[PDB]
Amino acid sequence: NRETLDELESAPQTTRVRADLVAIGDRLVFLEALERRIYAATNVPYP
Amino acid sequence: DVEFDALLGSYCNTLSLVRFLELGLSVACVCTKFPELAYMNEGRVQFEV
Amino acid sequence: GYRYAAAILPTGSILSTIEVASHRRLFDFFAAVRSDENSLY
């Protein structure tokens, strides 16, 4: 139905992170590679 | 123990309207109205050039 | 969607607008309905 109060309340606090954005034609597309970040040095394979 | 089941939010689309004049094609048309069509039965243009 | 009075508040963006159910039909419940059906009421 017309229940437009799905989630728009407060727009909570943002901060600034090291993020890599690219311009694929039109879209502003995020892009990050993550082995050294969180897949590093365990016995879990990378997906 | 307790045991409930859940309806976790539901989401509906908002279907859009289109004014045809709010579209780039209508420069090729002349949107002119005529409230008494169904009795007009004929029409013509005699085109002097 | 199943409980219709819950969907009277949509609380979210109906946003994709692509041909539903010609896709994977992965839904546990979905109803391809015309203008009306008695079970709505």
Swiss-Prot record, chain B:
Protein origin, superkingdom: Viruses
Signal peptide coordinates: none
Entry's localization field: Virion; Host nucleus
Summary of the function given for this chain in its UniProt record: Self-assembles to form an icosahedral capsid with a T=16 symmetry, about 200 nm in diameter, and consisting of 150 hexons and 12 pentons (total of 162 capsomers). Hexons form the edges and faces of the capsid and are each composed of six MCP molecules. In contrast, one penton is found at each of the 12 vertices. Eleven of the pentons are MCP pentamers, while the last vertex is occupied by the portal complex.
UniProt subunit comment: Homomultimer. Makes the hexons and eleven out of twelve pentons. Interacts with triplex proteins 1/TRX1 and 2/TRX2; adjacent capsomers are linked together in groups of three by triplexes, heterotrimeric complexes composed of one molecule of TRX1 and two molecules of TRX2. Interacts with scaffold protein; this interaction allows efficient MCP transport to the host nucleus. Interacts with capsid vertex component 2/CVC2. Interacts with the small capsomere-interacting protein/SCP.
Family: Belongs to the herpesviridae major capsid protein family.
Protein name (Swiss-Prot/TrEMBL): Major capsid protein
Organism: Human herpesvirus 2 (strain HG52) (HHV-2)
